[PDB]
Write a protein that binds this ligand. Structure first.
Ligand SMILES: NCc1ccc(CNC(=O)[C@@H]2Cc3ccc(cc3)NC(=O)CCN3CCN(CC3)CC(=O)Nc3ccc(cc3)C[C@@H](NS(=O)(=O)c3ccccc3)C(=O)N2)cc1
Length: 236
């Protein structure tokens, strides 16, 4: 059952934002080096598959360099029931896009704290001003922020990101500054509530800094990679 947290998320009263309600984002994963240090996020999209950013894997093409922590809220002292699962294979997107799949060495156990996010339909375009959520441990409690999507044609204006955003990316952010995903959130989810569940629409990718005025974050547009993702899962 994807996209439906058993523990309901709360909105705020990651730079800025607020601490998430514990386990309300049950697809959020922490990507760690074999040494155990958190450095990137990811999203569980099925029991055996995590989606992350390709740049998070820049340091090593060896699956043994990585492990995934599922079900966590605190980053350092992992709570008793947290799942640590190794990675058996890495799949970088084949056209140098900032997205990648991790096949876990064993399927995650689905529980009230470990649940996959839903994937969008191919080529869906999140509408301008849609309020979505980003989550992560970045720049030790899991944080969230609610940010509005900014349509690419506005985001690509000189006043904002000046032609840098591709159709395979989306923009989201508060243009006054102060609230944003940042480095340790890379690879993690941008999700949007659709009808009754959360759909993974973006993968935290890059920005001109973090939380700066007129510089919204850039996310890989997951809907442009669903067909590729499905083919990798089907054939591996
Ligand atoms: N929500 C804010 C937020 C900010 C950062 C992060 C963590 N992620 C990074 O660190 C990324 C890592 C990255 C991502 C994608 C890359 C290459 C590298 N490649 C394509 O996806 C390949 C396809 N193609 C490439 C070209 N682009 C389009 C897409 C267009 C463009 O210009 N892209 C661009 C890319 C990288 C950078 C700058 C610009 C450098 C740096 N930005 S920064 O200002 O120096 C910085 C300093 C301090 C703190 C944060 C940022 C920056 O973000 N690197 C999470 C969240």
């Amino acid at each position: 059952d994807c996209g439906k947290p058993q523990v309901e998320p709360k909105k705020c009263p990651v730079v800025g934002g607020c601490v998430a309600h514990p386990h309300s984002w049950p697809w959020q994963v922490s990507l760690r080096t074999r040494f155990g240090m958190h450095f990137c996020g990811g999203t569980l999209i099925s029991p055996e598959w995590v989606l992350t950013a390709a740049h998070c894997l820049e340091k090593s093409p060896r699956p043994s360099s990585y492990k995934v922590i599922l079900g966590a809220h605190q980053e350092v002292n992992l709570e008793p029931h947290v799942q640590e699962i190794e990675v058996s294979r890495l799949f970088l997107e084949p056209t140098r896009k900032d997205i990648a799949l991790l096949k876990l060495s064993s399927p995650a156990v689905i529980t009230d704290k470990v649940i996959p996010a839903c994937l969008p339909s191919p080529n869906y375009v999140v509408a301008d001003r849609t309020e979505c959520f980003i989550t992560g441990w970045g720049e030790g409690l899991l944080k969230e922020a609610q940010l509005p999507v900014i349509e690419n044609k506005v985001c690509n204006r000189y006043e904002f990101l000046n032609g840098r955003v591709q159709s395979t990316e989306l923009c989201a952010g508060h243009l006054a500054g102060g609230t944003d995903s940042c480095q340790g959130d890379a690879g993690g989810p941008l999700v949007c509530f659709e009808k009754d569940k959360y759909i993974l629409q973006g993968v935290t990718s890059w920005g001109l800094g973090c939380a700066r005025p007129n510089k919204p974050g850039v996310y890989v547009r997951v809907s442009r990679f669903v067909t590729w993702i499905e083919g990798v899962m089907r054939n591996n």
